């Protein structure tokens, strides 16, 4: 995409802390979430969940023809309900502005203006606050990492002008067709509107690439999840590639389901949500660490502080069926798939040293908050499959009728996810 001119680029001011020292960054919404329209006025493009088709009759006239616009300082507040101070970040669920109404948000970290922050997780310690309290049933607060581009596409796709800037380039492990841009281009060949969303669609291109999922979560259940991919970076896809869910979900380049760590559904039922061990009513501190030997990833554990208490990750507790594993190793991805019934494409994509070469070459920090118009979110929260009741099938205290996107906007439109003290720096130790 390029970029419009009618609304002026502001990025949200935001501090996080970088190896011991304070940084003021910023944050930048992902280019989805922006107006698509003519570069010669102001017509849209993108109109609704469909294309204009005199203007986008394919992707290289639609390409030529359109452009994303900025997101001034105004915007954020009254169009995303999207605030911030200091080191703490807010985003909102439901906003009805001006003539229109924004669903959730995406946001990437800025390292300046036109490039993101890049993270080496590697043989480090990342942490951060949340509170997810005002989170119900069927919505998501997600904070994770993505091996997007630094520059968001601008070097290697030459029809992207507006890049990191603009929030450009987003993929992840889903290999999402919902991406309006993908690898510089407009997405609109073979788009279908949504029937279940009315500002979402599907192009033919999907924008795959290797994604750490450190905190998924509302205040009735939370996972952190490795997902590799065996291609390199950013990368394009169609057909097949794409991994579509369905009958492809396994025959793509990335690996949709992850290797997954989630209490609940590892037999933990009271260590995360109201009134937990860790408690989802009150603010939390979530602490990654991810361990290396002989400078691989061979290990990401997992530590929560709340009112000064350490307490350690719960383990596997499927007695004399699954060790007690505590953290995301090689071992309990093998062992607990197994359990499952779950086919281990963590591993068939390149497993731990995918990931962890995956890690090396550095990631962007994504926020996100959203509903699923595709499962109800009850892979997270409730029972999935839904008439499923073999191990693995219960993943947290939720109705099988709960996370309808429908119901969740119409009766939690206020719900509302916090993250603060972003912070990177070596591995401590805990007590
Ligand atoms: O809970 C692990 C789980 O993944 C499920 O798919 C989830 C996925 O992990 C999540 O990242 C994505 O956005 O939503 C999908 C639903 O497709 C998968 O369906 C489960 O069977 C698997 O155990
Ligand atoms: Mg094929």
């Given at each position: 995409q390029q970029a419009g001119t009618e609304t002026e680029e502001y990025h949200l001011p935001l501090t996080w802390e970088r190896d011991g020292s304070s940084v003021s960054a910023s944050v930048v919404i992902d280019s989805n979430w922006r107006w698509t329209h003519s570069t010669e006025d102001?017509?849209?493009?993108?109109?609704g969940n469909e294309w204009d088709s005199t203007l986008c009759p394919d992707a290289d006239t639609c390409t030529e023809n359109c452009a994303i616009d900025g997101v001034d300082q105004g915007t954020?507040?009254?169009?995303?309900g999207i605030t911030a101070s200091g080191s703490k970040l807010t985003l909102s669920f439901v906003t009805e502005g001006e003539y229109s109404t924004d669903i959730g948000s995406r946001v990437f970290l800025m390292a300046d203006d036109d490039n993101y922050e890049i993270f080496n997780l590697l043989d480090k310690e990342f942490s951060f606050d949340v509170d997810?309290?005002?989170?119900?049933?069927?919505?998501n607060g997600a904070l994770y990492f993505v091996s997007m581009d630094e520059d968001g596409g601008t070097s290697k796709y030459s029809?992207?002008?507006?890049?990191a800037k603009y929030g450009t380039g987003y993929c992840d492990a889903?290999?999402?067709?919902?991406?309006?841009?993908?690898a510089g281009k407009?997405?609109?060949?073979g788009w279908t509107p949504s029937d279940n969303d009315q500002n979402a669609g599907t192009g033919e291109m999907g924008a795959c690439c290797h994604e750490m999922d450190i905190w998924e979560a509302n205040s009735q259940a939370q996972s952190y999840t490795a997902h590799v991919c065996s291609v390199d970076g950013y990368t394009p896809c169609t057909g097949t590639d794409?991994?579509?869910?369905?009958?492809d979900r396994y025959k793509?380049?990335?690996?949709?389901?992850?290797c997954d760590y989630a209490a609940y559904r590892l037999g933990?039922?009271?260590?995360?949500?109201?009134?937990?061990?860790?408690?989802?009513?009150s603010t939390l501190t979530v602490i990654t660490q991810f361990i290396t030997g002989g400078g691989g990833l061979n290990e990401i554990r997992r530590i929560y502080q709340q009112g000064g208490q350490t307490i350690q990750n719960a383990a596997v507790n499927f007695p004399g069926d699954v060790?007690?594993?505590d953290s995301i190793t090689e071992d309990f991805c093998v062992d607990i798939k197994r359990y499952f019934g779950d086919t281990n494409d963590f591993d068939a994509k390149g497993g731990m040293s995918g990931m962890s070469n995956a890690l090396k070459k550095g990631m962007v920090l994504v926020m996100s908050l959203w509903d699923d118009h595709?499962?109800?979110?009850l892979w997270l929260?409730?029972?999935?499959?839904?008439d499923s009741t073999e191990p693995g099938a219960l993943r947290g205290?939720?109705?099988?009728?709960?996370?309808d996107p429908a119901d969740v906007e119409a009766n939690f439109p206020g719900s509302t996810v916090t993250f603060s003290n972003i912070k990177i720096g070596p591995i401590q130790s805990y007590d």
């Open positions: 102001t017509t849209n493009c993108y109109d954020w507040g009254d169009t995303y997810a309290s005002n989170l119900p049933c069927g919505l029809t992207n002008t507006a890049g889903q290999c999402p067709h919902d991406m309006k841009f993908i407009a997405n609109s060949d794409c991994g579509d869910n369905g009958d793509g380049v990335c690996d949709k389901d992850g933990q039922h009271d260590f995360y949500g109201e009134g937990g061990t860790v408690d989802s009513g060790d007690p594993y595709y499962a109800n979110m929260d409730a029972t999935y499959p839904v205290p939720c109705s099988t009728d709960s996370g």
